[PDB]
């Protein structure tokens, strides 16, 4: 994949979802595709006119097209309904890993990152439509726990 230009300031709010895409370029290309799709759709709504922004989006579009071509025979790519299901099960698995660590009193970077990225993946799922009830709740909870546990650790508090 051809690298993207520097992220425009206008697109600060998709920075982290684009990192989730890169984290999955080998691990789960379906996840990587949909993280990019969310970023592209969101960016287009933010600013598709400012030259720096339009340049960035154009290149992101190139990445999406290359990935879709590479993964074309994959049902999760040809049917967004199936892609959504894939993202849902994947994000839930990650959320529950973090949840189970928390409820066992095991506080560490891996479970903080799992809560954080699970929340980003639920953001990504909005590209498909309305979040499920569980998605709304789990995302709210994951954003809370990622930051709360990080804060407890850095300051010597017991969660």
């Amino acid at each position: 994949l051809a690298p993207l230009p520097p992220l425009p300031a206008q697109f600060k709010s998709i920075q982290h979802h684009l990192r989730t895409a890169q984290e999955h370029d080998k691990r789960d290309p379906v996840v990587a595709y949909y993280c990019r799709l969310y970023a592209m759709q969101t960016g287009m709504k933010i600013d598709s006119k400012t030259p720096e922004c339009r340049k960035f989006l154009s290149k992101l579009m190139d990445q999406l097209e290359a990935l879709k071509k590479q993964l074309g025979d994959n049902e999760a790519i040809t049917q967004e309904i199936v892609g959504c299901a894939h993202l849902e099960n994947y994000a839930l698995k990650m959320f529950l890993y973090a949840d189970n660590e928390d409820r066992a009193g095991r506080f560490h970077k891996n479970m903080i990152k799992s809560f954080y990225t699970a929340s980003l993946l639920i953001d990504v799922i909005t590209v498909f439509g309305e979040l499920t009830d569980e998605n709304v709740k789990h995302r709210k909870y994951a954003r809370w726990k990622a930051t709360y546990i990080h804060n407890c650790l850095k300051n010597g508090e017991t969660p």
């Binding site: 759709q41 989006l57 097209e65």
Partner: peptide, 15 residues
């Protein structure tokens, strides 16, 4: 129409 919006729409077109 916009080529970017069009490419995105075409990318997401369910066939």
């Amino acid at each position: 129409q916009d080529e970017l919006s069009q490419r995105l729409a075409r990318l997401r077109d369910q066939v």
